[PDB]
Amino acid sequence: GMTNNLKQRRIILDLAVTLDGFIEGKNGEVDWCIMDPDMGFTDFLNQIDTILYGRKSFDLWGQYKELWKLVHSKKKYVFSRTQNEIDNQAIFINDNILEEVNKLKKNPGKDIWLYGGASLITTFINLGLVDEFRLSIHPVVLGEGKPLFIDVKQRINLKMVNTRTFSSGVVQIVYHW
Amino acid sequence: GMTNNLKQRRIILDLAVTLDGFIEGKNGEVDWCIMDPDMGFTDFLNQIDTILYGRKSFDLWGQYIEKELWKLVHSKKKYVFSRIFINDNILEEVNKLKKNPGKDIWLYGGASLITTFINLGLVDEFRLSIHPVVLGEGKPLFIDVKQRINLKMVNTRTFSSGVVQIVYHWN
Ligand SMILES: [Cl-]
């Protein structure tokens, strides 16, 4: 008989992305994002116990119909998103990030949603910390904005696991890394 | 009874794109690109009678030697444009072309010609085979776009390689 089980915990991105690869407009526009009832978002929430936010995403989106009762039922964890006024970009200590993420992964629990904002997401991808990419690719080309993939140093090969199409023309592809 | 039919001719992109939006590496790398017999490429070729190239892209692929796919490709009429590409000249060349009767048109390459036609509102279908690869740098399919383009998704096909071809109409 079984004496122990470890299901390894996963950090998961679940987001809308444009066809030209932007998760958000250049001034934070997300009007083009489409919430569809069949995206498996309730079922995705049930598979997570934690949500990661950087300070700027937490202070805006992070504390406020039924989806929001589930969302806010999750344990919330907040990273620093210092703004460097030199170049007006987010600045992180990557060693702190890895320490904090490992401290979390040490604990028992289910999966972890990396919520935002855009700069923190990007940083997690480039630290090799995202296990699963649930990408709702919208039938729009924004022309400019905040990219999902930026400052990528080598090829990231992915495994496609799910492909889902909606009446809206949105195609969700789920990739495991 | 019928006296005339016109099927309006479509200019179509059919290419491999990475997950992060690149149709080629920095230095022209297409090593990552996957060719599947189930991509409907025989059928796409049968629906076109014309292929558009830039001079740089024609020298590379325009007379390349499945050798049965290439026999079909080479059976098409070819327009080779010269080069920057100037907007007015392409528009004029394309309007001259669209005067003629016949089937659809494959915009083949290269990256800069593809971009010229896109930003001129000249691409009607985008057959995008998205590879499960983040290339990290290269030539983007969508580069220097001045307004939102809204698309109608018409087909989504998956492959055992993890490639996903989504077909879009610019309406
Ligand atoms: Cl943030």
Side-chain angles (χ1 to χ4, degrees), chain A residues 1-5 7-68 70-102 104-177, chain B residues 1-9 11-82 84-95 97-171:
Chain A
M2 173 181 78
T3 49
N4 196 247
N5 186 54
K7 185 172 185 328
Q8 186 91 301
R9 302 177 74 182
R10 298 187 333 191
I11 304 181
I12 306 170
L13 289 180
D14 187 327
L15 48 67
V17 54
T18 65
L19 193 58
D20 55 352
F22 301 113
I23 64 186
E24 189 174 323
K26 207 153 140 276
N27 321 271
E29 299 95 314
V30 291
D31 58 290
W32 58 271
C33 306
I34 294 179
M35 275 291 324
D36 193 284
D38 300 343
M39 265 154 199
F41 191 69
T42 298
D43 283 335
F44 163 68
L45 285 180
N46 300 332
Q47 108 171 72
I48 75 156
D49 69 0
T50 305
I51 306 179
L52 320 174
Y53 294 88
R55 190 71 49 182
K56 173 177 167 173
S57 169
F58 183 71
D59 285 340
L60 294 177
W61 307 51
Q63 321 94 357
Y64 199 97
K65 265 229 169 188
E66 275 299 88
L67 293 181
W68 291 100
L70 300 183
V71 166
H72 300 137
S73 76
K74 303 306 172 184
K75 262 182 284 126
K76 286 164 166 26
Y77 187 100
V78 197
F79 295 84
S80 291
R81 190 227 166 278
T82 308
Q83 180 87 338
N84 189 353
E85 302 299 324
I86 286 287
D87 52 3
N88 310 114
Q89 276 128 22
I91 188 155
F92 308 91
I93 308 165
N94 295 343
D95 279 337
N96 287 7
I97 291 164
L98 300 169
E99 269 162 17
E100 287 177 71
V101 170
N102 284 341
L104 282 165
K105 292 181 164 188
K106 208 158 173 192
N107 305 312
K110 314 187 288 171
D111 291 332
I112 303 158
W113 187 20
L114 175 58
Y115 186 99
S119 313
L120 183 63
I121 286 168
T122 271
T123 291
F124 272 61
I125 289 160
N126 295 328
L127 292 173
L129 289 167
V130 181
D131 302 300
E132 168 162 325
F133 291 83
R134 298 166 70 78
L135 302 187
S136 290
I137 307 173
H138 282 57
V140 60
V141 177
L142 281 197
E144 66 176 11
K146 297 181 179 171
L148 180 60
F149 301 110
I150 189 179
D151 293 303
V152 166
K153 304 312 195 195
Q154 51 183 341
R155 296 186 182 181
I156 301 149
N157 296 289
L158 299 145
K159 183 86 143 203
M160 191 275 277
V161 309
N162 213 285
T163 293
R164 191 174 287 192
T165 68
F166 301 85
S167 49
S168 53
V170 171
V171 184
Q172 186 187 46
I173 318 171
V174 184
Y175 288 112
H176 291 170
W177 172 65
Chain B
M2 187 187 87
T3 55
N4 202 262
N5 190 65
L6 169 116
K7 196 176 174 317
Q8 186 88 313
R9 302 172 80 198
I11 293 174
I12 306 168
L13 280 175
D14 193 318
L15 45 58
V17 65
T18 63
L19 186 54
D20 55 345
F22 301 116
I23 67 193
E24 274 176 61
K26 200 207 188 150
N27 333 274
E29 287 97 317
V30 293
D31 54 291
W32 54 272
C33 305
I34 296 178
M35 182 58 63
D36 195 288
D38 299 328
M39 253 146 210
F41 192 65
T42 291
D43 285 324
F44 171 69
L45 284 167
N46 290 340
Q47 100 172 64
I48 75 176
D49 64 4
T50 306
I51 308 179
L52 318 179
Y53 302 88
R55 178 50 147 156
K56 202 194 140 193
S57 177
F58 170 84
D59 290 350
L60 243 245
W61 304 108
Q63 314 180 346
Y64 188 95
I65 50 168
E66 197 70 47
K67 57 191 80 181
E68 285 286 324
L69 296 175
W70 282 106
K71 285 153 192 161
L72 296 185
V73 168
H74 293 323
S75 74
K76 306 309 174 188
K77 279 160 184 327
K78 299 173 183 177
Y79 289 71
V80 186
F81 295 76
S82 308
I84 201 176
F85 293 108
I86 312 303
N87 292 327
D88 288 33
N89 302 319
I90 283 155
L91 288 167
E92 173 184 28
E93 286 314 333
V94 164
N95 284 325
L97 156 57
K98 291 175 162 206
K99 241 99 157 205
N100 297 312
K103 326 229 296 301
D104 292 328
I105 302 131
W106 192 13
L107 173 68
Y108 187 102
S112 286
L113 193 60
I114 286 171
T115 285
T116 296
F117 274 70
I118 291 176
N119 296 317
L120 282 172
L122 302 168
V123 186
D124 300 306
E125 301 196 19
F126 298 78
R127 271 172 132 250
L128 301 188
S129 291
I130 315 174
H131 288 47
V133 78
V134 178
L135 218 72
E137 69 204 292
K139 299 196 192 154
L141 178 61
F142 299 115
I143 193 191
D144 291 312
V145 173
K146 313 312 216 83
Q147 343 69 12
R148 286 191 189 176
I149 298 162
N150 298 296
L151 301 167
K152 187 165 220 153
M153 182 277 287
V154 306
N155 207 266
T156 298
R157 188 170 292 171
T158 61
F159 305 94
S160 47
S161 56
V163 171
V164 181
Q165 186 182 53
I166 320 155
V167 181
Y168 294 100
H169 288 188
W170 180 69
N171 282 342

